[PDB]
UniProtKB/Swiss-Prot annotation, chain A:
This is Nitric oxide synthase 1. The lineage of its organism: Eukaryota, Metazoa, Chordata, Craniata, Vertebrata. (6R)-L-erythro-5,6,7,8-tetrahydrobiopterin binds at residues 36, 368-369, 382. Isoform N-NOS-1 is expressed in brain and colorectum. Found in the Auerbach's plexus of the enteric nervous system. Isoform PNNOS is expressed in the penis, urethra, prostate, and skeletal muscle, and coexists with the cerebellar nnos in the pelvic plexus, bladder and liver, and is detectable in the cerebellum. Ubiquitinated; mediated by STUB1/CHIP in the presence of Hsp70 and Hsp40 (in vitro). Homodimer. Interacts with DLG4 (via N-terminal tandem pair of PDZ domains); the interaction possibly being prevented by the association between NOS1 and CAPON. Forms a ternary complex with CAPON and RASD1. Forms a ternary complex with CAPON and SYN1. Interacts with ZDHHC23. Interacts with NOSIP; which may impair its synaptic location. Interacts with HTR4. Interacts with SLC6A4. Interacts with VAC14. Belongs to the NOS family.
Length: 407, 411
């Protein structure tokens, strides 16, 4: 009820009080830790509304003030009449930023308060969605000088009038299963790439084909759109010493923009809410490039470094993993597209933890996700105990719409 | 009630029913996960349930459940408890107990080996000198001139908690660390306090970077006594690199025998406070943590200096690059000298098949992800992509506080 977290490298010890304001459930019990699992009416809404608005009015130095009470009453009357309510702009901006402040899996939260919010709640069709999305992508990209942004489409209603971006990110490469047996392009999107073509996408069948957005408006059938190619900034990957690296023909996109999540604010569900920041290098170099289920390039790379692939113990995978990540970071820097390395980003996160501890009483953080997928223990987050708990407003994972949409 | 873990790399799904035989608290709640926190006299009343649970288990495993042998041993243990307040394990129960503590060790990546453990029964030991001798024999048997073999030595159990056997060392073989007046350390920063207790206790310190601490040994609640392990018993490996000839001029070496001696073995409710055990190193324990943690030997800067890396910007990944070379060097060195060692690719792959096998044969495998995933190259080892349930089975190994914090000094 006054839990402590120790850093084992610096002996700094922090006291967490924020967790007793925790609301949702984690997956763990005192009998079983599920720390490493990827996925663990009118009456319901008003308390959720009340909970959120109380924190909002607290944060603006106006807890228990006339303006505060007036809003609680106004919101109560709207729920009782309509079955829901609408957020004020300012509430909506606060909510969005706080959902980012609460994502216990994001290492990047030092930035949480710098988030440009684009209120797309007046949108009604998928063409409108496309327009809004294009504008997001162009604003956030900013010719390589990336800026965090989120775009918020209309909240859930009866629940068969949902807005969704069917893509899991705004910008992703296609995947096709070949007669050969191997996979061409990105194997993570095969399923979605099929559903695209089935809806009429004229696939070029390449290894790096920017997918078309599939947008669903007001619970209607999903429609296809190509993002203006001049909007999708991409980066050709070269190595600062390995001249031959460019011949693997690798590129990656500059803008990471998660588009399949659900934002919950004060009991309201915003099911379409793509948001974007900028990459930490290991996300592309370690995961996208090297995972077995992804582009899986280690073998090809090791082979050109003429490493001894004869036995695991030469650590050829490890050697090649590093140079790949050096190449990712080098290319982005040379092309002036914002990117942060895992050292700098984890170091930023420790400052941000310490700031949230002294300024908020804590910081929910999921160690399994915060510690980079390479070089863990030489980055300072490895030595840092973290408590993970679920606060609201938050981003939540949601089922792929195709598993749930009625056609 | 069943639970499922997915492998996100292979889509294999496993079902855990083993967690239903689970006892101790995790530290987690439905509200908070403490999955990354390092640290999450027993009366007569509480002992026979624990004895019975253990002995039902043992007898199950030897295919004798409900036998006469089983019922008599239950009765016999009951009697011992009500007559003496404690009880004594048979040899075969001890062995089985200690194999299972290892099998249940959720933070141990080496568990495929659990059924091959050499148990040394040291329950007749009465004095520190006695402990020394037992320990020397352990070291020598386990080392086996570099062909390492897993072993554990088990000293008498806790009684009233006033007569505890303890090995004050955290590992039987570990180097000293000496804080200097300038603020810097010579040797292993992690052993400064304990090294200080050793000097306090009469040890004459060489004051070098790789000085093997003396054993500090407590028997029957008495004050502990010093003993130098015989240096001919201390296998060491000097660290060189297969391509970099300057690496040996860093002056590094490490001991071959990893032997944790600070944990408490719990079997059937009995508490063995001195049960030092040992196996063989995974390369990354030395090469990443021992050598490259900032609060340890901290050699990353010196190594990257020699490699002429660009050290002016973290994004050159000079730290990451020097780290791998070092790890290549540790493994090269152990292999050339014929000392058993396993790399992390090999260790995790072995672990994944053990875990799978355990699920089929036993209905689960408690695994702590935070500890199982190696501290470099995380996602190119198959453990990274593997969901894991963490839960506490007995018999088990527990952390216990350091003795100097608890010991009542006799004089
Ligand atoms: C500004 C630079 C940012 C950086 C460097 C960053 C970093 C990261 C990283 C490395 C992860 C783990 C992702 C993975 O391995 O798949 C992550 C997860 C996440 N971040 Fe960020 N982030 C940034 C911006 C944002 C923004 C603007 C938001 C919200 C508006 C956000 C919210 C999230 C959420 C909700 C997750 C977890 C997603 C999941 O469960 O898959 N991040 N972040
Ligand atoms: C085959 C040789 C072995 C290898 C390579 C191995 C591997 C490992 C590694 C890498 C760790 C974590 C290291 C750390 O961060 O300190 C560990 C932890 C552990 N292992 Fe093993 N293991 C081996 C044998 C054994 C044996 C023989 C036992 C006892 C019978 C054992 C019980 C444990 C326990 C209790 C822990 C957690 C210790 C703690 O909480 O500090 N292991 N194992
Ligand atoms: C089944 C499933 C569940 C879940 N909660 N998340 C995933 C996402 C899976 C989990 N690792 C790979 C994939 O993430 C891709 C998104 N990456 C971009 C980023 F989120 F990491 C990111 C990075 C930098 C800035 C950002 F704004 C940003 F959003 C999958
Ligand atoms: C506060 C604290 C709690 C806890 N449960 N363990 C520790 C021990 C901490 C945990 N990582 C650093 C320090 O261990 C040093 C020795 N480890 C050796 C080994 F266990 F990893 C090992 C490796 C290989 C074979 C073995 F038999 C073996 F026992 C510290
Ligand atoms: C804070 C965190 O739990 C701590 O640094 C852990 C992380 N994972 C680890 N994993 C192993 N094998 N050994 C360790 O000492 C640690 N340290
Ligand atoms: C099973 C395990 O939870 C899974 O591999 C997780 C581990 N940590 C992760 N960490 C990050 N940042 N991103 C991921 O996709 C994952 N995957
Ligand atoms: Zn947990």
């Amino acid at each position: 009820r006054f839990l402590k977290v120790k850093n084992w490298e610096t002996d700094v010890v922090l006291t967490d009080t924020l967790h007793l304001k925790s609301t949702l459930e984690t997956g763990c019990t005192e009998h079983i830790c599920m720390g490493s699992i990827m996925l663990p009416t009118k009456d319901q809404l008003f308390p959720l509304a009340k909970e959120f608005l109380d924190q909002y009015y607290s944060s603006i130095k106006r807890f228990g003030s006339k303006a505060h009470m007036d809003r609680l009453e106004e919101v109560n009357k709207e729920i009782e009449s309509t079955s829901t309510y609408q957020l004020k702009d300012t509430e909506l901006i606060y909510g969005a930023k706080h959902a980012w402040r609460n994502a216990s899996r994001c290492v990047g939260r030092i930035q949480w308060s710098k988030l440009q919010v684009f209120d797309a709640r007046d949108c009604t069709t998928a063409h409108g969605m496309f327009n809004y999305i294009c504008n997001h992508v162009k604003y956030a990209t900013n010719k390589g000088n990336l800026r965090s942004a989120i775009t918020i489409f209309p909240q859930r209603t009866d629940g068969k009038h949902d807005f969704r971006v069917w893509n899991s990110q705004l910008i992703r490469y296609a995947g096709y299963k070949q007669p050969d047996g191997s996979t061409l392009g990105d194997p993570a999107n095969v399923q979605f790439t099929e559903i695209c073509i089935q809806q009429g996408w004229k696939a070029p069948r390449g290894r790096f084909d920017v997918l078309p957005l599939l947008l669903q408006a007001n619970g209607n059938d999903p429609e296809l759109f190509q993002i203006p190619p001049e909007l999708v900034l991409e980066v050709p990957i070269r190595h600062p010493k390995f001249d031959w690296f460019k011949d693997l023909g690798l590129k990656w996109y500059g803008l990471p923009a998660v588009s399949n999540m659900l934002l919950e604010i004060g009991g309201l569900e915003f099911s379409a809410c793509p948001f974007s920041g900028w990459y930490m290098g290991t996300e592309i170099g370690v995961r996208d490039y090297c995972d077995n289920s992804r582009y899986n390039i280690l073998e090809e790379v090791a082979k050109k470094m003429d490493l001894d692939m004869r036995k695991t113990s030469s650590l050829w995978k490890d050697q090649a993993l590093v140079e790949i990540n050096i190449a990712v970071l080098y290319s982005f820097q040379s092309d002036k597209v914002t990117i942060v390395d895992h050292h700098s980003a984890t170091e930023s996160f420790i400052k941000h933890m310490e700031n949230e501890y002294r300024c908020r009483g804590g910081c929910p953080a999921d160690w399994v996700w915060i510690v980079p997928p390479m070089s863990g223990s030489i980055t300072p987050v490895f030595h840092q105990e973290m408590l993970n708990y679920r606060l609201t407003p938050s981003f939540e994972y949601q089922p792929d719409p195709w598993n749930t949409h009625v056609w």
